[PDB]
Design a protein around this nucleic acid. Structure first.
Ligand SMILES: [Mn+2]
Ligand SMILES: [Mn+2]
Lengths: 116, 115
DNA sequence: AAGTCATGTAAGAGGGATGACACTTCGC
DNA sequence: GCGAAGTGTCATCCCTCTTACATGACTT
């Protein structure tokens, strides 16, 4: 399977969900909480749990159980490709100049400093 | 703030801005690259409503190439929206060494395609 | 058992898409 | 003129989010 076919028509909310899981697997309300900080507003859980179940059936996210009241959601290999594919597509269109490039390099470098 | 504008944007609109980040284009030119991204035919009745809706938000400047042609381009505010949801996904992707190595290889293979 | 936590779920509501129909303008 | 390019517009479908209500599970 190729992620492009199933990961280029997702809503911004669904793409932001996969971006979150790209950092590491989280449970339902942990994704809700880190999405809420991006938007600056509340994220109605009635919007989150259905969007994650759609992302699950498409093969982008997997659903495992921590308790049985809690589910830890994590990207499938296809889902990881979905994030990589869209990141390649943005950098393709952002790295249009030598100036644009190193703006990315320092963006990465700064994020490399943030780990320890 | 850039995140304020960036956060409230359809995916179809984030794609329009990423298109204009590469180069300022005219209406249907944007359409054709969005068709090459989606693998779909992009209804122009959907391209122009949003395009003008991004001009209402201040992220796109609608100039005029010819009396029948418009040239769309990103504003400074428009470009800062693209930068900061680039920064957002890169902060979440760069989670370890191999994710950093992977990114900089993309930018390397990307920067080599500019000749 | 009490108070949460975590998730499931549907009706109505809300907002963009579809698929046309229209105008002007350019090139031959 | 004639065809096409480029864009403007909307009725309606379409689909998602909102906004609640709902349950079982973990902690004490
Ligand atoms: Mn909630
Ligand atoms: Mn069209």
């Amino acid at each position: 399977p190729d992620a492009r076919s199933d990961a280029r028509d997702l809503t911004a909310f669904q793409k932001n969900i996969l971006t979150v899981l790209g950092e590491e697997a989280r449970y339902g309300l942990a994704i809700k909480r880190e999405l809420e900080e991006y938007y600056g507003e509340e994220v109605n859980h009635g919007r989150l749990y259905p969007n994650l179940d759609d992302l699950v059936n498409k093969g982008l996210v997997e659903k495992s159980e921590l308790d049985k009241r809690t589910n830890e959601y994590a990207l499938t290999n296809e889902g990881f490709d979905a994030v990589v594919d869209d990141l390649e597509w943005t950098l393709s269109k952002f790295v249009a100049d030598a100036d644009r490039r190193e703006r990315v390099e320092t963006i990465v470098a700064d994020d490399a400093a943030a780990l320890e």
